[PDB]
Amino acid sequence: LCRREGLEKPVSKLVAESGRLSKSPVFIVHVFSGEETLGEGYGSSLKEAKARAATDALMKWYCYEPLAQQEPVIDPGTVVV
Amino acid sequence: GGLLWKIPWRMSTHQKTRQRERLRNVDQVIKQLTLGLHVQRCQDKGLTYQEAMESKKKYKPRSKSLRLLNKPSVFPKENQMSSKDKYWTFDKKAVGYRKGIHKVPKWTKISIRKAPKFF
Amino acid sequence: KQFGFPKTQVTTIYNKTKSASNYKGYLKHRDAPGMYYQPSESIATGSVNSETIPRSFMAASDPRRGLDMPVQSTKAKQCPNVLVGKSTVNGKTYHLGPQEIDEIRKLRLDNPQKYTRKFLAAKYGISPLFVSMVSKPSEQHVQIMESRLQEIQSRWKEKRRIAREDRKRRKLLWYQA
Amino acid sequence: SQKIGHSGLAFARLWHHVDVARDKRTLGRLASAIAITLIGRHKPVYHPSQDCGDYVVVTNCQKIRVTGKKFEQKTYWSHSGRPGQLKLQTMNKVVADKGFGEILKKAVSGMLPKNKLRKQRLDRLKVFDGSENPYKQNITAFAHEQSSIPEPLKESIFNQ
Amino acid sequence: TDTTPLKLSNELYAIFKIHNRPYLVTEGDRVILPFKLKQAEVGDILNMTDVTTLGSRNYKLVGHPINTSLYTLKATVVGKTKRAFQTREVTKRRNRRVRHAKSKGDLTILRISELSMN
Amino acid sequence: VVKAIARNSIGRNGVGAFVFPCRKITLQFCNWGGSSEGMRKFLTSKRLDKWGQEFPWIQFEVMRKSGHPLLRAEYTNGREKVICVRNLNIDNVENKLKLLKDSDGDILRRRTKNDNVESLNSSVRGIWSPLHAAKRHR
RNA sequence: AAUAUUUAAAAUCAAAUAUAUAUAUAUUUGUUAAUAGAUAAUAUACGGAUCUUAAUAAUAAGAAUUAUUUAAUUCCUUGGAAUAUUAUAUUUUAAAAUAUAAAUACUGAAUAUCUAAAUAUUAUUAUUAUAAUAAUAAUAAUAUGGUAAUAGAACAUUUAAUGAUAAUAUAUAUUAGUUAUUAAUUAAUAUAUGUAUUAAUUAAAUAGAGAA
RNA sequence: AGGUAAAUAAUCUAAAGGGAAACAGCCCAGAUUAAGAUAUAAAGUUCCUAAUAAAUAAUAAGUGAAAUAAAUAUUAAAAU
RNA sequence: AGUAUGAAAAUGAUUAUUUUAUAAGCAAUCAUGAAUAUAUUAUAUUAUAUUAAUGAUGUACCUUUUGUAUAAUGGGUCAGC
Ligand SMILES: [Mg+2]
Ligand SMILES: [Mg+2]
Ligand SMILES: [Mg+2]
Ligand SMILES: [Mg+2]
Ligand SMILES: [Mg+2]
Ligand SMILES: [Mg+2]
Ligand SMILES: [Mg+2]
Ligand SMILES: [Mg+2]
Ligand SMILES: [Mg+2]
Ligand SMILES: [Mg+2]
Ligand SMILES: [Mg+2]
Ligand SMILES: [Mg+2]
Ligand SMILES: [Mg+2]
Ligand SMILES: [Mg+2]
Ligand SMILES: [Mg+2]
Ligand SMILES: [Mg+2]
Ligand SMILES: [Mg+2]
Ligand SMILES: [Mg+2]
Ligand SMILES: [Mg+2]
Ligand SMILES: [Mg+2]
Ligand SMILES: [Mg+2]
Ligand SMILES: [Mg+2]
Ligand SMILES: [Mg+2]
């Protein structure tokens, strides 16, 4: 999706972390494209958090609802991976 | 004394503040009573309510009990009262001839401002 | 900053550190009439909210782009990389020609035990994923590997199988949003 | 409506450090502060029916403040049940036996609510007389805080 | 009162007060008032007036009350009804007389049909 | 890759078009039977007609049976209230009928303190998080 | 410094209020603390934890004791005004200036109000059919804890008088609904019965049992 | 004397609710049924436990912190 | 001590659901997770029912007394009287 649009490559980064070396940690990771954050993802593991950030980003992409005052938004199709 | 009436010999800070507030309220009530009477008397003479309220010369109450209450020697105000008379009654059978007002029954309703001159 | 509204915490009249759950204190707290900025005390993971969506995902004719609400509180310079591939850290390389690819394919079919993905990657300066994308192994090798995996699974206790199932369920749940 | 959403982060057990060398509170006040955290009263999602309180790692507990002459006077009691077995230990003696962390724990226990979750809450408190401790690596941290800390110290901590 | 962010936002909540009882709502929410409404019948629409707070995710307009011109907030009266019937017993400790305190309070189910910045 | 999860919508009766909860009422009486006197009187005396005129979305069935007099309502959700109106006067019967028409069909239920609003909607503000709070704890 | 008393606002002084009023008169208020003395038998016993502060160094603690107070502090007459505080926003160069707000401390009962419901009385209405009545519904007010006791109103059960109806019915039981509910009713299920001394009004009672 | 005898008032008796750790008789306050927004009473506001911030003095004895133990002694402190 | 019938209870064994081996007191009520069952309008992010996670409140009943959780009276339980 980032490639398709005029966006920098997305990378996931630890924002906040607590309870590493426990039964139930909390890892907050943000998928940044440049300095802009696209998706925020919490998780018990790092991997999980990363996944969640990506899913959040995708949700924000797809479930974007424009205003009625805006001129019509025709999307450029589904992101064919 | 096997039954335990666990009442402390002295009052808390919060209790004392409440007592003070109560004392202030009774003074306020008295003031209102005198004020209303004055207003009524002004009206009888023939002034409007506002004019009566403005009036320089306030009329003192003619009835006896009210007049006594107005006097601070008989019935002092909370600001006038001593620290001791706010929180301590006179009790002739106590040591110190003094007893906490909170130990008086129905002290929240019953008023007792004036203690004897040297007790 | 487009808007210059005063900003407020979600204020109780009581001690917030001791009585955060006490709704009564919140109910009591009146604040002067007007517009405020109450920044949300929440992660924006499940939210489809318009104040949560980033500006790049908003349309060009969206009025909301200009307004300052998708706040960039974090900074990418300060945050460290998590589970990032080696291609992302040092860029993608498209160096291997057709001949090299063909050689790799030949090698992999011939002997996947000797010429494994990692070894190929090491040889040609490329990713194991890319090697996989390029070349299939001999299907026999794959079958053997599947059989080994099945044997391992069988070797488990009841508890381990259940745990694996739970893990799988959790994984599935992650991608829901 | 307010309740509906992802609640996993709200009910997340965080880990709270307190360097007793830095903290200027006396023992009892510190214990009281800890108790709330342990219960989970600090967090608005709290409910009495649910244990939802955080971990508290106390460290450098040897430098804990105790007013008056309580260190040589204050007596900690104990009793099995058999008469003539009342065990009374002064605070300094208790410290010598176990540490200042034990003392803190006792205070925190007394602060906590007396029910089935009390023990769990007490367990979540992790006290240490000196500096070094295993939970060093799991105290809540943020990326914005990292500039304050020097470069090699972080690496050393990670290694530890 | 620059009420532009609220107007823009897709999600939006209100904290309207009926008889000083606050109810935090979005559109579609189903309020359950703990009394019998006499004025409105079932099917009637209620235009909420004492609206304390109107909030987005990050902003909120607040008034005592908010200007009626700025918003709309239409509830629909979707059934007067009652709570479940209960009978707690009242009695003293060496007394065979046990007075039954029967109770079955009234309810009014509203539904918040419309909520938007005008 | 993205895949759908098959899911169905939830009807909120009020928001678009209000469908009236009470759909049908059955007045049941007995020609014999002294308990059915007030019901019989109600049926006779021009009140029922007025009622029907007022509420043309409800259908008003009138039945005769040997037992006690009955008021059974029928609601949109599929539930059925049945009130026995034995030995009640005309006015009491009418009040009962009014009560029935007022009801949304749902079962009676104990509510806890301040259990007021019932939302399908996700919170407009998020759910709280300790990492994302304004004031950090200590 | 020394000796010896007193621990006091009566006098005295200071401060405040009220009458003529830059003063006089009358009233009101203001005068120690610590320790020792100290003390028994299941076990420490403020209800328990615990409370006494500390620069460096915290966006941060410093009685949780005793005494006199306040609801940010200071003047003026509950109220306003000024002062700095705190928080926030804006502008300028982490600071300065401008402005908005907070100053109504809070908790707390089955108290009071509000919000609805019930009964009773008083006073007004409305609707429907001793109509100066009855039923139902409004509004305002007052009342509704209760042993001994007094008074009023109901229900379940059984018998007698009158009495439609019917296995698509009735009775009894179980479960789940309904009606402000010791009761009855709806549905399902079960077993009986070709069927209620049935609904209703009267008359009566071997008429209601965790208490001998 | 938690004694006894009467006098006056209140409560209990026959009164549930809040406070007084627990509590017939103390401090508030009288349950027709709910509801739980607002005023509150007595009593409270570090935690257990619903709720708090200040000011000026004094204490250092854990004195004391809701059940005040005396004569006397010692050490200070003011005033004359 | 008639004859039929008898899911009347106390009472026993067994099965099912659910809770329970770090927790302390009339064993209930209210709050509140979870698990299970039923549901020919669960459209569901559903509804009811059952069940000692966890939290809070809670000193059997009667009699007799100035006054009873009382370690005062009386009752083993249920059915009929
Ligand atoms: Mg009793
Ligand atoms: Mg008695
Ligand atoms: Mg004098
Ligand atoms: Mg002792
Ligand atoms: Mg205490
Ligand atoms: Mg009341
Ligand atoms: Mg009565
Ligand atoms: Mg009999
Ligand atoms: Mg019996
Ligand atoms: Mg009985
Ligand atoms: Mg008696
Ligand atoms: Mg009385
Ligand atoms: Mg009582
Ligand atoms: Mg009453
Ligand atoms: Mg609290
Ligand atoms: Mg002590
Ligand atoms: Mg004591
Ligand atoms: Mg266990
Ligand atoms: Mg206990
Ligand atoms: Mg007793
Ligand atoms: Mg006994
Ligand atoms: Mg016993
Ligand atoms: Mg016996």
Distance E1 CA to G91 C1' (A): 21
Residue F117 CB lies within 7 Å of the nucleic strand I? no
DSSP reduced 3-state for A22: coil
Residue of D nearest to C17 (CA): D42
Backbone angles phi, psi at A12, to 5 degrees: -90, 140
Between CA E74 and CA E72 the distance in angstroms is 6
3-state secondary structure E78-105: EEEEECCCEEEEECCCCCCCCEEEEECC
Q: Do the Cβ atoms of C57 and A13 come within 8 Å?
A: no
3-state helix, strand, coil in chain B (%, to 5): 45, 5, 50
CB of E80 within 8 Å of a chain F CB? The answer is yes
Distance CA B10, CA A69 (A): 73
* Cβ contact E115:E25 at 8 Å: yes
- Which residues is D79 bridged to in the sheet? D86
Nearest to F26 by CA among F101, F118, F137: F101
Question: SS3 for C96-133, per residue?
Answer: CCHHHHHHHHHHHHHCCCCCCHHHHHHHHCCCHHHHHH
Selected for mutation to probe chain D from C12, C15, C18, C21 (highest D CB count within 10 Å) is C21
- The answer to whether the CB of C40 falls within 8 A of the CB of E57 is yes
Which nucleotide has the least CA–C1' distance to D117? I54
Q: Of D54, D63, D58, which Cα lies nearest the Cα of D136?
A: D58
How many angstroms is C1' of G114 away from CA of E88? 25
Question: Are residues E81 and F111, on separate chains, in Cβ contact within 8 Å?
Answer: no
| Half-sphere exposure of residue F95: CA atoms within 13 angstroms, side-chain side | 7
Strands D55-59 and D15-19: parallel
Q: In whole angstroms, what is the distance from residue B81 CA to residue B115 CA?
A: 10
CA distance B89 to B74: 16
B3 touches strand H (CB under 7 A): yes
Gap between the Cα atoms of F135 and F138, Å rounded:
9
Beta carbons within 8 Å of F116's beta carbon, 6+ residues apart: E23, E31, E32, E33, E34
Specify whether the backbone of B106 is left (phi greater than 0), alpha (psi in -120 to 50) or beta: left
- What letter would DSSP give residue F118? B
- Whose CA is closest to E51, among E25, E26, E14, E78? E14
CA distance D153 to D104: 29
Instruction: Give dist(CA E100, CA E98) in Å, integer.
Output: 6
Q: Which chain C residue has its CA at the smallest distance from F138's CA? A: C17
Strands E13-18 and C34-37 come out as unpaired
| Least Cα separation, residue F5 to chain D (angstroms) | 19
* F84/C134 Cα distance (integer angstroms): 81
Q: Answer for the pair C84, A29: CB distance below 8 angstroms, yes or no.
A: no
Q: How far is the CA of E24 from the centre of ligand 6 (A)?
A: 28
How distant, in Å, are the alpha carbons of B52, C56, C121, D43 from that of A7? Answer: 81, 8, 29, 38
Q: HEC string of F59-109?
A: EEEEEECCCCCEEEEEECCCCCCEEECCCCCHHHHHHHHHHHHHCCCCCCC
Please check whether residue D35 is in contact with residue D113, taking contact to mean a CB–CB distance below 8 angstroms: no
The H or E element spanning position D118 is helix D118-124
Chain D contact present for C72, CB below 8 A: no
Give residue E97 CA to ligand 9 midpoint distance, Å: 19
Q: How many residues does the structure list for chain A?
A: 81
CB C50 within 8 A of CB C65: no
Is residue F68 within 8 Å of residue F86, measured between CB atoms? yes
First to last CA, chain A: 9
Q: Which nucleotides of H are covered by protein (CB under 7 A)?
A: 1-2, 9-10, 14-16, 20-23, 25-29, 31-38, 41-53, 60-62, 65-68
Resolution in A: 5.0
Tokens at F66, concatenated: 């040997």
Which CB contacts under 8 angstroms, 24+ apart, belong to A66-70? Answer: A66/C59, A66/C62, A67/C62, A67/C63, A67/C64, A67/E8, A69/C63, A70/C59, A70/C61, A70/C62, A70/C63
